[PDB]
Write a protein that binds this ligand. Structure first.
Ligand SMILES: [Mg+2]
Ligand SMILES: [Mg+2]
Ligand SMILES: [Mg+2]
Ligand SMILES: [Mg+2]
Ligand SMILES: [Mg+2]
Ligand SMILES: [Mg+2]
Ligand SMILES: [Mg+2]
Ligand SMILES: [Mg+2]
Ligand SMILES: [Mg+2]
Ligand SMILES: [Mg+2]
Ligand SMILES: [Mg+2]
Ligand SMILES: [Mg+2]
Ligand SMILES: [Mg+2]
Ligand SMILES: [Mg+2]
Ligand SMILES: [Mg+2]
Ligand SMILES: [Mg+2]
Ligand SMILES: [Mg+2]
Ligand SMILES: [Mg+2]
Ligand SMILES: [Mg+2]
Ligand SMILES: [Mg+2]
Ligand SMILES: [Mg+2]
Ligand SMILES: [Mg+2]
Ligand SMILES: [Mg+2]
Ligand SMILES: [Mg+2]
Ligand SMILES: [Mg+2]
Ligand SMILES: [Mg+2]
Ligand SMILES: [Mg+2]
Ligand SMILES: [Mg+2]
Ligand SMILES: [Mg+2]
Ligand SMILES: [Mg+2]
Ligand SMILES: [Mg+2]
Ligand SMILES: [Mg+2]
Ligand SMILES: [Mg+2]
Ligand SMILES: [Mg+2]
Ligand SMILES: [Mg+2]
Ligand SMILES: [Mg+2]
Ligand SMILES: [Mg+2]
Ligand SMILES: [Mg+2]
Lengths: 188, 58, 126, 142
RNA sequence: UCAGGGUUCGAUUCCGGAGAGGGAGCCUGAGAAACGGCUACCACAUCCAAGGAAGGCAGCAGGCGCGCAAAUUACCCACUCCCGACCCGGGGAGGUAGUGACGAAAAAUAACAAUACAGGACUCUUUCGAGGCCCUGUAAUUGGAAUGAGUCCACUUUAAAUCCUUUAACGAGGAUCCAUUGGAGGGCAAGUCUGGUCGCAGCAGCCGCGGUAAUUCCAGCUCCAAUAGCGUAUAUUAAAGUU
């Protein structure tokens, strides 16, 4: 039957062709340790979103200059990159995009900024806090560790206004034990 | 040699049984990867040029 | 109190004798606000009555805090009784619902389609 | 040493390639159809059958054993095929005259390994797996 | 799927065509060679007082059969639209919920201190040795803190409900609120451990293992790869400059 639905969906990664290759396994394991991710797939996502930028960059760079299409779409792609802190406005041209490394998309993750902006003790502690709804972007709780922080959103990350760590009722542990002083240590 | 030489399931039957000894729940998920990074990259106490494998016995 | 109403994209519709708008409810710490408790504050906002006011939608964001819904405020009561969908007049009783399934209606019609002149007992004796 | 290169030779090139494809074995059996007509399955991945009896086939030298096979007759075709049983002591789960679901071996038409002329293997005996009948996760329904 | 060229697929929600068991003939109408219309032959099948009558799920559910192979005889016109003499009636079209590891997106199963051992830059001592800051495990406890999976009042949702989101009350010490699937000679990441079997039982996609001292079989231990998923059979594409 005809039906009122979107079937449109897509994949966001690609497995590697050589399944057991040491130069690969040791590099990806390094990248998992240094940013505290969960699978290899959390790396293959970033590899995909970079290798797809590097196809648009190349196909533009193989157009001739002064083109309408190349001008418009290049000025649009550099803007989109600069706006997330992967590129420097002092570069602002296509032949620099080909010089970006995977460890710049990983660096802009919310998990990374929550550690590097000081709110957590380690890159692993940060992933726990985000997932426990302790942090807020701009008047908005967030719960996704992989959220990518836009350039001017940077200085808004702070602890949630309904949370123990800063203006909030103590959690269900600090309250069960303070009650052990009046229900387990006073008459119990 | 005794019985039918073709006796099916010979070795799986006459093998003596041993239980799983363990108790310890292993780690899972991100916390497991956190383990493997530390053991393979953080502290690697130095050794002679004849390098060794992570399950070596001999 | 924490609760607060703020309207948005207001429009005075004369072609249907109502004014319609969008409603923002800044209610941190608490559960969602009951619809009754909203419509009386809209009254105090527009100075009419908690009887020509209808509100619906009201989805709450992630994280708590805000919710946004749609609201309409009629001129008379009877214009609301004409221009509203029936189930929205049922919510706060101003209408009632009848025959107890789609199957019974369907199968009565199919038994009645086999007699002529007076369908009689198929309704009058069930 | 000569292949027409000219600007209007497309008919020759196409009609010649269309011919030479028929010497490529792997293409030929996809399109003559005599393979699919002769296949003891239906051109499917799996087929049900009834176990006629149990045999052992001596493996091809140098290595030596007796390989513990069923001989099955398939439901849909009715044609007879021999199948391997895939683990230590499984041949005791297979009673006689029950059903089975045979599958392929792994090289798409050809006898695998040391066994002479056996091209299929069992997965289910009576709606229960062999891997579960053998690991203990389930027992025979009787 | 794909450097560039190509190869293979398209019953399947949009558009066009064709058909209501098979063939044939026609009524009515602006429009039909119409089957939720009629007439006759062919094949099936139902009721009978044996005179007669009645039928077409390749609509929605449901059942038999077939097979390697596919969900409930639920709810409702509130949404999108259509039909009618019509602002009002009707709609298995269509919407809603149920079953659903076809498949796609996000993402939990532990965080942090103390203490003890372990290891390095640094300080001091001719060294030894000591002080030590930065990390890792690893132990015993602990140490307290954090939070959902759940149980569950209300609001919200909607045609009426469910779900998600919003919220009170309970809910974590690790012996559970327990991660699996396949491997460990080579290709190909990981043991020249221990016990058993003796060219047997078996493994093995390929080369090859087993004949009393098995890195390959059966199992314990340890280790490897992906991980809420992994293995197998099959069709097909790249590898194939082997069309
Ligand atoms: Mg259908
Ligand atoms: Mg020839
Ligand atoms: Mg041949
Ligand atoms: Mg050989
Ligand atoms: Mg292409
Ligand atoms: Mg088509
Ligand atoms: Mg067909
Ligand atoms: Mg279909
Ligand atoms: Mg069509
Ligand atoms: Mg046309
Ligand atoms: Mg039919
Ligand atoms: Mg007419
Ligand atoms: Mg007709
Ligand atoms: Mg029709
Ligand atoms: Mg009729
Ligand atoms: Mg008839
Ligand atoms: Mg019909
Ligand atoms: Mg049907
Ligand atoms: Mg069946
Ligand atoms: Mg299926
Ligand atoms: Mg079936
Ligand atoms: Mg309608
Ligand atoms: Mg109506
Ligand atoms: Mg439907
Ligand atoms: Mg899936
Ligand atoms: Mg669990
Ligand atoms: Mg929940
Ligand atoms: Mg209700
Ligand atoms: Mg295992
Ligand atoms: Mg094995
Ligand atoms: Mg072993
Ligand atoms: Mg190997
Ligand atoms: Mg190796
Ligand atoms: Mg011995
Ligand atoms: Mg031995
Ligand atoms: Mg041994
Ligand atoms: Mg090919
Ligand atoms: Mg070939």
């Amino acid at each position: 039957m005809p039906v009122a639905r979107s079937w449109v969906c897509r994949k966001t990664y690609v497995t590697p062709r050589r399944p057991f290759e040491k130069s690969r396994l040791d590099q990806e394991l390094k990248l998992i340790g240094e940013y505290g991710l969960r699978n290899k797939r959390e790396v293959w996502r970033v590899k995909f979103t970079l290798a797809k930028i590097r196809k648009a960059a190349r196909e533009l760079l193989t157009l001739d200059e002064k083109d309408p299409r190349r001008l418009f779409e290049g000025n649009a792609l550099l803007r989109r990159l600069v706006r997330i802190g992967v590129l420097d406005e002092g570069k602002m041209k296509l032949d620099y995009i080909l010089g970006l490394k995977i460890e710049d998309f990983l660096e802009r993750r919310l998990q990374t900024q929550v550690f590097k902006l000081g709110l957590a003790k380690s890159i692993h502690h940060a992933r726990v806090l985000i997932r426990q709804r302790h942090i807020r972007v701009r008047k908005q709780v967030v719960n996704i560790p992989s959220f990518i922080v836009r350039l001017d959103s940077q200085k808004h990350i702070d602890f949630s206004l309904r949370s123990p760590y800063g203006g909030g009722r103590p959690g269900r542990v600090k309250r069960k034990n303070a009650k052990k002083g009046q229900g387990g240590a006073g008459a119990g | 040699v005794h019985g039918s030489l073709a006796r099916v399931g010979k070795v799986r039957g006459q093998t003596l049984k041993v239980a799983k000894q363990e108790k310890k729940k292993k780690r899972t998920g991100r916390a497991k990867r956190r383990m493997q990074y530390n053991r393979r990259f953080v502290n690697v106490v130095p050794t002679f040029g004849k390098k060794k494998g992570p399950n070596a016995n001999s | 109190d924490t609760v607060t109403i703020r309207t948005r994209k207001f429009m005075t519709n004369r072609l249907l004798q109502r004014k319609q708008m969008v409603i923002d409810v800044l209610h941190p710490g608490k559960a969602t606000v009951p619809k009754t408790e909203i419509q009386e504050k809209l009254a105090k906002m527009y100075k009419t009555t908690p009887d020509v006011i209808f509100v619906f939608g009201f989805r709450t964001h992630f994280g708590g805090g805000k919710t946004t819904g749609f609201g309409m405020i009629y001129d008379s009561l009877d214009y609301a009784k004409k221009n509203e969908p029936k189930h929205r007049l049922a919510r706060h009783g101003l209408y009632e619902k009848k025959k107890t399934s789609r199957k019974q209606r369907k199968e009565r019609k199919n038994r009645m389609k086999k007699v002529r002149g007076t369908a009689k007992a198929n309704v009058g004796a069930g | 040493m000569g292949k027409c290169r000219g600007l209007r030779t497309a008919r020759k090139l196409r009609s010649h390639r269309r011919d030479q494809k028929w010497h490529d074995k792997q293409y030929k059996k996809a399109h003559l159809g005599t393979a699919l007509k002769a296949n003891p399955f239906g051109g499917a991945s799996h087929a049900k059958g009834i176990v006629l009896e149990k045999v052992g086939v001596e493996a091809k030298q140098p290595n030596s054993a007796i390989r513990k096979c069923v001989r099955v007759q398939l439901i849909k075709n009715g044609k007879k095929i021999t199948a391997f049983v895939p683990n230590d002591g499984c041949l005791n789960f297979i009673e006689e005259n029950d059903e089975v679901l045979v599958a392929g071996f792994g090289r798409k038409g050809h006898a695998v390994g040391d066994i002479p002329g056996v091209r299929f293997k069992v997965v289910k005996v009576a709606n229960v797996s062999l891997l579960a009948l053998y690991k203990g996760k389930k027992e025979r329904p009787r």
